[model samples]
Target: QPEPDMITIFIGTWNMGNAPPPKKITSWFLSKGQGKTRDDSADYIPHDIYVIGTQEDPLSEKEWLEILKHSLQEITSVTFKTVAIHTLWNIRIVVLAKPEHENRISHICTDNVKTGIANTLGNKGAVGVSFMFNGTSLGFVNSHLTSGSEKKLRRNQNYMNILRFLALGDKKLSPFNITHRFTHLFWFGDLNYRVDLPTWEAETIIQKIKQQQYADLLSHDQLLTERREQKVFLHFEEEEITFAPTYRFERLTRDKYAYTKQKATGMKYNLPSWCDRVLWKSYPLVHVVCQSYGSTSDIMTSDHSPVFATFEAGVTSQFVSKNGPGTVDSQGQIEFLRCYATLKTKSQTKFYLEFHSSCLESFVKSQEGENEEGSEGELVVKFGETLPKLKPIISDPEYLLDQHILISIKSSDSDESYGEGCIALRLEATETQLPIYTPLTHHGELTGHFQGEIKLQTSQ
Candidate 1:
């Protein structure tokens, strides 16, 4: 897949449950949303657009709509944009659209497994949602399998069946070309198959994805070490900070039972793990840069610290083809030699436009008095600091002689029947300033043609 020019994606996961209840959920919101506001209170109500997660509840169709509408109302109170929600089973997936690029999301679809259209053998899971960016399509699937040996197998089989349904389509073996289709396919959520920790179950799933040509963003070793040390799957490794654990069950402040009550073991907060992940197809991410990845460490709001990552999409060029050079000049000669020079020279035309746009009226009156009889399109050369070198003056006519020059025309401004013409030429170019391309075979070849030894003579 080719690289994207200008797109940045941020992903995060937070599980606000798996433990005891709080006095007020609104208080929890104040605690989490406020930066250094308080320990137990949520700073602001969690917005779906900012983070997406699963909740342990089921609602009717009307209830779901109401839930979403209410959530949107609450979100809009705090934010300017609307929050997107997709309810599946007990969890509601929320996507916060970035204000600058909200228009990029063209289409979204959520599949409900409970609809009976998607077959499952064991515990239920969501069919997931797909988001389209420009022409690139990205699918995100979240699931949490059931526990136990026999039940686990059934859960995985069911998940695989869901995946099979997601992958396969009518008249096609797969809905998406797994090897060469979509730009990205991300599968995340708790699998619950932690054997002391979450290792890449090579025999079960990792190997299968590898066969399908899917690449795991996190390496096997990174996952293992992060799980063991942090007791959590996430390892936040930005240059300024080290491994800051996001999951901490025991509240920072102590209560009346701090000294005596037998508290449950810190299994929830003991270790940090990134079992949840965002996966991308190699095709769309050839030049993509992973800016950062981690879980937001607001403990009181959720048991699972929301894991997030920002991906910087790389730029791709389309006008220039890989096979050969571009365009031709007014002349018939092949012109690859002057490519860079012509590009840089064309950059100077900007000054011309600035001067014309600023003083067009004054210049028109001045031109009427002086006998400067030339077409408005005629080139203007400015050489202030240094004298011209003893060579053919760099002119547009010479530049146009090249066989591969792209021409740009500027419109005429005079109102009367073509009183004046100003063919302002503008050129935009990007040059690869890296080392020159050399054939691989040249690296090791030491043929005697210009090699062997150097002759030296001693002179008195």
Candidate 2:
């Protein structure tokens, strides 16, 4: 089947300050009624991917993941699979994709950096995740930089530190830097870039927002100035902010600014600014068309309103094909069906595999011997003389008939070598003499003795 040319993506960022999760988040994810009121039927439009970032979240990582998954499922009928989730102290980022496209997403990785204080604390830092979707690599970063109106250079340094610290994949396997790793990159969160005006003057400018004069206020936005001067976010693009400032709002109210208390007390508080924002960059291989960019005022759970952006991202059809680069080849296909393994003496390791062929049969060959063919009714393989004996414990004929296979292998050695090795699988047709060969993917270390079976699957 031909893939769609474009996929709708919904990105959101919020700073909850250790507060309870919101009662509902569906409206914030919707693209309609962005700057104004939300439409009742806005949930009908399903997005292909959802990227959400939060700062100063109060819940544990597992608790936040479950809460977000449950909240989203409660509001929308769309069945989304949680693709990636990461947290750096108070900052968290999650990515969800449509269930049908889950298989197309692979090579998921995450990294984080600490920038608070002397850079040893995670109180203020960045967390990011990168993955292959539809054959194109993409990354999302959720950052919380130092707070203060005078810390523009500090924030810029924080961004540079994040870019230098964040990486995808293992150091030995497939390490990649954020700047050049993915075809598209998204950076969002409570960046805390303040306005360059005095509190009183900033208040005056903000009040003019009632007159629809926000562009003037944005001219003094420190983040914008830094970006314009190439001080930070060198090549990134952000849609014009047509909405009001998203920060320093009165708790649980959209019409009031939370700055009056500081003003009344004559304290030195930073001026109101659009601290929460979303920005992106795309390479030559992809095109990102921003459809909407604004903040949602309906959800008043945090002092800062949640900001969101909708995009229509175009990707090459070849980049998403099942037989595209980085995937198992069509002829005698082979790839890592699972992430990692924990092996021990006399252990059983089970991994799943999907094979596609018209009349090919499954067989196993030892590293030292020639191809040893097996019957079409069952799948078999050998582990060689040096390693423990391996035997297939389970087979699904129905899946095999459809060119899919699942098998479990058990080792006989009572010692823990957990060494790395490969077993070749040769496929041959009953009518043809020629055969196709592929090797089994394995991980090389074990920490303890395995008492029970170990089931492995690809990370979502």
Candidate 3:
């Protein structure tokens, strides 16, 4: 069976309100097996990744890590390990993965953006971890935006503040949009987006929360309104709310709303909105399926209940085949190459193929992979996987002769090609018959090579 490039990821977020976490929080991540056979349960097939975020957290880094590791071990035999953890004051994000995924994940880095008290304090901000897993770049950010009934504008500002500042392991491409660097990004936290309805109306709406009143409830949510108007979170997406909102519940009642409080001047039931939410977005061709999205209502340690989502997220893994030369694009003129080739070099330090450039002046719609922190010596080239559309720099084949299509690795976040090789159009077409190999050069010296079927389209 072909190994599917997609993987299941379990992402959960809880605004703990600085409450001490209850022991054995496994229920937040896994559902109890409800099938006769073990293979039929959700836990039978474990997630490849687990991203847990907590806002207003009370645990230390070591304490949280120990709890997470112990909790997962109690439920699944997948042997999950903590890959990265980052904390900014009250906000924390922990990235965990299966041990087998260790080698497949690279360029692991963390970054945080502070948005509290004139952008200097860490009380309100985000903690982010970004990495390349199986050839696809991923970014996860957990944020705690401003909270208030009338501070929707501030929350919107908090969103842009992180998007503009949080560096997903980048200093050269510093201050870039999250979408530009990451192939897939999951943003979750207590975003503090509230219901825009008045307090009096919320009192009446609170009693009708039993039926399918979510349509009416969501209609007044600030997050949906801002997203609909395209004022913020331009291309982000959320699952349909099949469960009740996960914010502002009374800790004791667990089922009752935290309506009137001494903290609020007069606003009762700012109406339990979906403040603690999860949203995700992807670049061009990545596929993400949200299998389940619901809250862990039974774990009632905090005012905000925990929300969990199961995703079958796609990854662009290396294309490794045993078949030798000519197994790749065997039929065509090789005018357009669709082979997955691997390259290696003798490097003292790590390097990445941020992207392959097209020098001969042809065009295509996409680049399917990126290694953000420079993938070691060897790198996999997945050219034209999605779009094999091919054309020439010049329509005339004669001019194409002797011109080389360069497969070069650019310098980090720069325009200069560090190491490069070429696919030359030989007048003698027989040279194109085999799996072509060209030397990767730097200042006319051999550093590496490109061994693939990227033969030049010498003619019609």
Candidate 4:
């Protein structure tokens, strides 16, 4: 049984071709002609999560992340924070989620494959990330396939390479391949598949596009042919595109095609195509409903227009309970306060606990040691060493549950030498003995087990 509600996710993909970042991306996010009006519901609805993908982006990975982060937060009233960012060569993918829902996002993993120049360079390829969102696992891929009117086979090969290249967590983890590991997978970027029709015929079809007859043009799309032949994107789902071709646009013009044989010094000019696209697939336990899918022509920085899609992801309630493990109860309640800590000393480490409930008590143990056997042995970190601030957990209508806890670790004693160990926490109700323990396991390479010794250096 999936939760009674759905979460909205917005995804956008653009190929910047080394151009500078846009001055203002607010117009691309807002509804057509709405122009930054927050009160107008018709303008745009704030999403719970945002996934942005870029290919051939010239900005430094850090610069791109900061620019996108500022634009997203500046356009909406809700507080959103960056969850993860991955960049491979010129391709980059960034994820952002609401602050209230940040803890629920985990298992962040990224992988990439190069199809360019002896399969070693990153000129063309895909970069992907997978994570669990509110118990529903999701994967996102940003790919730049081989580009050419006659490169259909190479494009299909690129698709297969992404499936084998992108893995979640470690190789030992079950369901290593992202396609099978995630409940829902979103693939987007410049696919570079062109229309199968002749150049003259394609130009005629463009006229029909102006008349709102998109089906006439889509019938000959090479990507569709490849999918029908089971060559690529075997089980993916793409919303019917009513918009015009998203590629080969002239600079600063909406409808003018950018390339021509005469202008290109007699070089072959490829026909316009819906190269920028968004495709998704869902497991049996999840359902992804595409709210809207289309290309935004307002920004003309590059030849390829940006494509955006809004999705309402629904997960089966049974899948949620089975996959959530220790963090969530059968009732989908977050039962514990989970945090990662690094200790280099055996001396007492003080942790200040803050929560809304009165008289809260906490128990600590090593995750790999006694915690796994359900034996809460010697406390690794001294609990209640300092008075916890009396901060109330704010009740927000947007969140599904109100259970929240805050824990702060104090600086360890200078003279103590402690080895590496994973910490586990358990919180119990002060009045009632309702016990809830933190999950012993965590995904992501950044955090997990303790591997090394303590080398504490003090500044003179």
Candidate 5:
């Protein structure tokens, strides 16, 4: 199958132990069996698989697996690339691979055996899972880490264990050095450590990665905001969006009922805070847009609100249909103008560009099609003149091959800090192979097609 021009992937982590009885996830089959209707109602379906940590309920592991099997019967529709399982005490972690991306998934990592590092941490009690998507590999360990005075020591060991796992993997596999192959490596869970300390430690981890020129995606710089006086932590809030808070006891607004009992007894009814954290690795090919959603829409479903970000992968493109209704001739160009205009108004953005690239012979052969010229392509599109903020153009949602234009934003002012006047670059190639030096100027800008001298950059 042809590689996807662009893939929209979602990542979310939550502590389900606070969940009531029927909600704990045990087996992949049981978790995914819940259809979209019920799953949507639940608001957290078990996609592919789920890793549960610190499940202290009295039910035996065997009993829980039965429950999981039952849920699997609910949504047994999609085929998968691979599925793996590992269990440690009360925690269970699983990995599910998409068919096309299966080769990237590592079976050795998923074996039931625990890594020596994980064992030494003495907290393998927390369920952990690792999975790879496309060329990007990620490690997820969900633990309600040790708390109280000795908490720091426990977390430190936990961090080391994680490092050891990475070191082991690095030895066996090729280092993901290509800025273009921006694979992600992440570790997220309710670590129960303060951000002041963890933030410092997280930075240390970033420095260690920089030995290979990699860094953390969630930086402390991204944590600053004036409206919220308190430093960014797990439980603090700004404009209704709360960071990950582990304890929410004192904040319960509804104290008239059994709320007091719920709070006084255990960690179950706490409001929440930043004790839980999401950590990430940075690669040139991947850009991180970090933001959190509040508990308002997601509270009743789980104590922890789901946190997510859209990872704009390194490569993307626009699609063109040669034999279909959307051809790119004069009539098609008119239709493109209309579509682009409508998107601009709806999105409230001033500029737009539509660029296209042709597929090479290898790409055509892989698809079992004739090696026609300009068959498959992707957009080497970029935004912002300075450090690009998370702001994405609403118009021209995605650019397709052969039929689309590549968009670029050129700031009028040399000042790189704030927004400035911008431009776009749109281009299309008729030949079977694209030139190494095709100029961005050929694609044009917001105003007109280019007629001046154009300098080109080679597209890999």
Candidate 6:
């Protein structure tokens, strides 16, 4: 049977475990295809979208982000733009999409939450993003939970914070629960759960791994037991486990399992477990099918091996975009488009607000003063707590017809106006010029937080 085109998603989760990135990470991005049947009948197809979530990244943002960005481009000549990116102490996540359908996607929300060291530290927390793609809403949470074989309960509690406080529900326009807020959801990373078997079984498990026998070890897997018992990850779906455990290996070395000296330890460091994983769930229905799920052993920099999963997501709009094009008259003066908005708030309370332009279809007489076009609303924010940094997907491929569109503030439902201010819309930015900024009320101030470029358009 000939193949059909579908959206391919490649998601990867790693613990990084305190070491910086190396030169080439191609092994993490390459697909092994189907294990056996794909040998002669298969072909190598690059993933269309990539999601990377790693924990324990000790390097600064500059070192990690640039190195990863360049390395990815070095392998795949295509330009993969970072659609959404955010970082918390040691946990960071970034979502990248191909240029082919970048314009076809419309999304503008991302958030992170802390669940460790008094719920104020990032040592055990999550970073996530939510967006609308092909008429379907998708959400992602890459987390690092509390560790220890006996701390399963603590880890489970840590997961609860990700679902309850990730702060993307307002961005998705809500279910009160982030799990049901999106049509499809992916939650993965180093969960830090361990195997149930005693230290004695470690040697037996090592022997079985050589024989490709994982049944015994899997039966004692902590994640599997928890999911089956409904203690956590309720309703979540994961591909079967075939690969050996992903943690407790000797650091910077391949094939050698690490085992702490039984009699000599303040804290035992080596009972192997499948600590890293990639799990996904689709709500209300199924719109994704797993094509491949496995771990790579090519890089031994960390004690934890990276785990990845690939999915063939069904897209209803393979031939259409949800946001359509609209027309306008040629009599317009402010030719610049304000696709980016930079917002700065120093309020000490939680609030909700948004800033945007007027309608793109309405025609206005030239750049005399301003035109009422684009839009703004429903961006729930907690300014006092340093909200997550967000970079929304690109604007619609069509044109906006107004000049100096109106920017407004939307008050939360609490009856008190949160931010009472309006800024100029129509400001564009480039290497030589800067985007425009206006003002706001309580909580948020403006010092040029927007970014956009010039686009030329003529009337029909």
Q: Please give the lDDT score at residue 272 for candidate 6.
A: 71
Best by TM-score: 3
TM-score of model 4 vs. true structure: 0.65
The local lDDT score (0 to 100) that residue 171 gets in candidate 1 is: 19
lDDT of 4 at 3: 46
Per-residue error for 244 in candidate 3, Å, reads 1.1
Q: After superposition, how far is residue 431 of candidate 5 from its true place, in Å?
A: 23
Residue ranges of candidate 4 with Cα displaced over 4 Å: 1-5, 31-44, 116-121, 169-176, 262-266, 315-460
- What's the count of clashing pairs in each model shown? 38, 0, 3, 6, 36, 13
> lDDT tens digits, residues 87-140, model 5?
555445444433555554453353222222443544343444554443344455
The residue-by-residue lDDT of candidate 4 on 334-407, one tens digit each, is 23223333433233444222222111223222222111211233334422212222211221212222122222
Query: What's the TM-score of each model vs. the native?
Result: 0.41, 0.65, 0.68, 0.65, 0.41, 0.65
Q: Report model 3's TM-score to 2 decimal places.
A: 0.68
Regions of candidate 1 where Cα sits further than 4 Å from its true position: 1-4, 18-51, 55-84, 99-102, 113-124, 148-159, 167-181, 195-275, 314-460
lDDT per prediction?
A: 0.33, 0.61, 0.66, 0.59, 0.31, 0.60
lDDT of 3 by residue, 351-434 (tens): 333222122223222344333222665655444333244444343343334233445544333444445444545445532634
lDDT by residue (tens digit), candidate 2, 1-460: 6666678788889898567856776667774434533356656667788898999888887787777677667767766799888887789999998887877788899888888565436488998988877545678999999887778888988888887678763232221236444557889999999778876675586677667678778898999999888688865789888888887877777777766446543465756788999999765325688877878767887788888887888643322224323333233223322122222323343222222121123332222111223344222333222221222211222211122222223332332222322222222221222322222212211122111112211111
> Which prediction has more favorable lDDT, 1 or 6?
6
Best by lDDT: 3
Candidate 3: C-alpha RMSD to true structure equals 13.3
Model 1 agreement with the true structure over 94-161: per-residue lDDT tens digits: 55554543565656656544312334433346546665554444555555544322233454454444
